[PDB]
């Protein structure tokens, strides 16, 4: 934290932030998500970091340099120590990458090695190469040393992700997945892991062995699992927590914005709120009936009306706000509803379904105030609009993920946060064979475009390329876009360090204060 001249710091240095929901792990091999990143950060620190504004700076890396962006070299600082004061070497991060791009790990972040292009990552998660074959080196203790198969110019931008952070071997070789409890742990982070109650409470405490100790302030930060957003204001407004989860309560969101002005904190996020279609399953393997819900859903009702949290309209997967992105609005999207409606109504009919026949089908969503409303609406509307049945289905966090990766599912409510900003962040979950792909979608066209994008040489063709991508997307109706999120949370007075400037919220609690109040 860099605590401004004039501050005056609070006596007691702790923060309690609520999380959305009970992580799935915290082991950054074996986590997908935003809550389980949020806690990641402040436990393990790979090669690069995002600054309080979301700059790529140092992390583990003090320097680095890159020859024709195909041969990555990291200079590890020397003073890296994990929490039980053994160093942080290159050893580390390529017993860790390697243990990502191992099949018989099961990261849902395999393929993240596959979107920085590591060389042979392709063949190791077929099973064809030994992880060991991994385009990485340690040259020596602090120096790490990538090799990518094509040029890759944002390739360090990947690098803040948790599922490129460091993994110490000799826990988890020797606890295995109970590696991650407080009496096993080790971490590299500015916190450690001092408690972690199932649906209660994860506490992390001061790392003193974080080599960027002395500009830490948080003592202590507390990590909730609360999924009701009204709750979680609620406990705010209390006193309990001093940063709400951002996923806003349709119920008290007008409330706040008049109530507190100054606490509410809304600024530009790189996610995408929609409808996650089961690409490979009857009846949703047919475009007609993808079709038609896409252009059924009103979403100028949900986000203006039903919503209103100063979301926009969504037309597209990657949001259009994303480094790179010059996309191109769909005519569809510019229709009146009424005209949506009937298009959708078409398309139905020649899909088979009629009024004794109608099309009925799930709505799966996490547990969340903001998504049973929603979805309830469009279940409504859905039903308005088009005459279709849906069953609503509420899971908690891990498992509707792992129902989505299954694929027992029909359609699902789904949202993706860019990773690093950069187009391809969001457009390589869809790929064939992304391990990101919850939407079991398989274009060999769409598969070819993005391939195509490091083919050229320059930022105008790439660009051109990921719209005709986003096309692609569309025009086989492979979600169905609702709104582009934006960050909205409540954060008392006194907590210092919070920019809201990264589009991609990758918050570090050793960057924040306690100010006097």
């Known amino acids: 934290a860099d605590v401004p001249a004039g501050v005056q710091l609070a006596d007691?240095?702790?923060l309690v932030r609520n999380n959305?929901?009970?992580?799935?792990?915290?082991?950054?091999?074996?986590?997908?998500?935003?809550?389980?990143?949020?806690?990641?950060?402040?436990?393990?620190?790979?090669?690069?970091?995002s600054d309080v504004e979301g700059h790529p700076s140092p992390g583990v890396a003090?320097?680095?340099?890159?020859?024709?962006?195909?041969?990555?070299?990291?200079?590890?600082?020397e003073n890296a120590k994990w929490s039980d004061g053994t160093p942080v070497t290159a050893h580390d991060f390529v017993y860790s990458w390697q243990r990502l791009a191992d099949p018989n790990t099961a990261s849902p972040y395999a393929s993240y090695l596959q979107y920085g292009h590591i060389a042979n990552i392709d063949d190791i998660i077929a099973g064809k190469k030994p992880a060991t074959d991994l385009g990485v080196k340690a040259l020596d203790d602090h120096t790490f040393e990538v090799t990518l198969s094509e040029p890759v110019p944002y390739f360090y931008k990947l690098l803040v992700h948790p599922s490129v952070s460091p993994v110490p071997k000799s826990a988890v070789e020797k606890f295995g997945d109970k590696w991650t409890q407080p009496a096993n742990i080790v971490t590299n982070g500015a916190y450690k892991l001092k408690n972690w109650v199932?649906?209660?409470?994860?506490?992390?405490?001061?790392?003193?062995?974080?080599?960027?100790?002395?500009?830490?302030?948080?003592?202590?930060?507390?990590?909730?699992?609360?999924?009701?957003?009204?709750?979680?204001?609620?406990?705010?407004?209390?006193?309990?927590?001093?940063?709400?989860?951002?996923?806003?309560?349709?119920?008290?969101?007008?409330?706040?914005?008049?109530?507190?002005?100054?606490?509410?904190?809304?600024?530009?996020?790189?996610?995408?709120?929609?409808?996650?279609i089961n690409n490979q399953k009857a009846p949703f393997n047919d475009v007609r009936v993808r079709t038609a819900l896409k252009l059924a859903l009103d979403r100028d009702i949900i986000v203006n009306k039903v919503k209103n949290q100063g979301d926009l309209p969504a037309y597209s997967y990657t949001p259009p706000y994303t480094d790179g992105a010059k996309l191109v609005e769909p005519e569809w999207f510019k229709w009146s509803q009424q005209k949506?409606?009937?298009?959708?109504?078409?398309?139905?009919?020649?899909?088979?379904?009629?009024?004794?026949?109608?099309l009925t089908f799930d709505l799966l969503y996490n547990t969340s105030d903001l998504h049973k409303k929603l979805a309830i609406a469009v279940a409504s509307i859905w039903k308005k609009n088009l005459g279709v049945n849906v069953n609503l289905e509420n899971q908690?966090?891990?498992?509707?993920?792992?129902?989505?990766?299954?694929?027992?599912?029909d359609v699902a409510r789904a949202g993706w946060c860019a990773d690093y900003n950069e187009p391809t962040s969001f457009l390589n979950t869809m790929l064939s064979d992304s391990s990101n792909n919850t939407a079991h979608y398989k274009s060999p066209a769409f598969d070819?475009?993005?391939?195509?994008?490091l083919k050229v040489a320059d930022d105008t063709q790439r660009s051109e390329l990921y719209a005709k991508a986003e096309q692609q997307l569309d025009?086989?109706?492979?979600?169905?876009?609702?709104?582009?999120?934006?960050?909205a949370r409540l954060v008392k007075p006194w907590v210092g360090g919070y920019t809201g400037k990264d589009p991609l919220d990758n918050i570090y609690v050793k960057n924040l204060y306690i100010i006097k109040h």
């Open 340 to 358: 949506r409606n009937e298009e959708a109504k078409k398309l139905l009919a020649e899909a088979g379904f009629t009024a004794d026949k109608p």
């Open 198 to 276: 199932v649906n209660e409470r994860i506490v992390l405490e001061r790392n003193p062995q974080y080599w960027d100790n002395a500009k830490t302030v948080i003592n202590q930060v507390t990590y909730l699992p609360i999924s009701s957003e009204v709750t979680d204001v609620n406990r705010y407004r209390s006193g309990e927590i001093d940063m709400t989860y951002n996923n806003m309560p349709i119920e008290l969101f007008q409330k706040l914005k008049k109530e507190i002005p100054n606490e509410v904190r809304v600024d530009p996020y790189l996610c995408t709120y929609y409808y996650e």
């Open 62 to 77: 003090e320097k680095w340099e890159n020859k024709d962006f195909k041969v990555w070299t990291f200079h590890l600082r």
């Open 396 to 409: 908690e966090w891990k498992t509707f993920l792992d129902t989505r990766h299954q694929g027992t599912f």
């Open 448 to 453: 070819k475009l993005i391939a195509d994008t």
């Open 20 to 49: 959305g929901s009970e992580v799935q792990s915290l082991d950054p091999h074996k986590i997908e998500g935003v809550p389980e990143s949020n806690v990641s950060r402040d436990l393990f620190e790979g090669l690069l970091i």
């Open 475 to 487: 025009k086989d109706s492979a979600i169905v876009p609702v709104y582009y999120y934006v960050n």
């Open 12 to 14: 007691k240095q702790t």
